[PDB]
Write a protein that binds this ligand. Structure first.
Ligand SMILES: O=C(O)CCC(=O)c1ccc(S(=O)(=O)N2CCC(c3ccc(F)c(F)c3)CC2)cc1
Ligand SMILES: [Zn+2]
Length: 115
């Protein structure tokens, strides 16, 4: 349906130790020159570009390629984080999802969504 369901990964997500401090702006894909359509993987804090859709819109597939190598399922679209939530995608469930632990998962990378 249209409503975003809770990811089965959200409660128990393992976030790796020694995370980067993710700034509030100015990000780049670590694999190419893209400065828009960037996805923060919530396990490892990688910042990588969104996929090429079958219409030829979107990025260079760096975040999806990283998922295929790591199995790390949850990513948040940088620039969509507000006090009211964010755009969160599950590669595993293949859907936009709700992460009830989003505030904690972002706080891991020094992101205060409330700000
Ligand atoms: O990228 C990544 O690596 C991570 C994010 C990701 O894989 C992903 C996949 C599917 C969706 S979606 O199902 O919500 N939807 C898919 C069609 C999109 C679209 C594109 C162009 C349009 F012109 C349009 F009208 C719609 C809008 C978004 C959202 C995100
Ligand atoms: Zn890229």
């Amino acid at each position: 349906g249209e409503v975003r369901q809770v990811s089965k990964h959200a409660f128990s997500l393992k976030q790796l130790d020694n995370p980067a401090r993710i700034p509030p702006c100015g990000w780049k894909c670590s694999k190419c020159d893209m400065r828009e359509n960037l996805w923060l993987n919530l396990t490892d804090g990688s910042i990588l570009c969104g996929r090429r859709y079958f219409d030829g819109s979107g990025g260079n597939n760096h975040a999806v390629e990283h998922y295929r190598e790591t199995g790390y399922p949850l990513a948040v679209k940088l620039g969509t984080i507000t006090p009211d939530g964010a755009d969160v995608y599950s590669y595993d469930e293949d859907d936009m999802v709700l992460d009830p632990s989003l505030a904690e998962h972002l706080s891991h990378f020094g992101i205060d969504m409330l700000k």
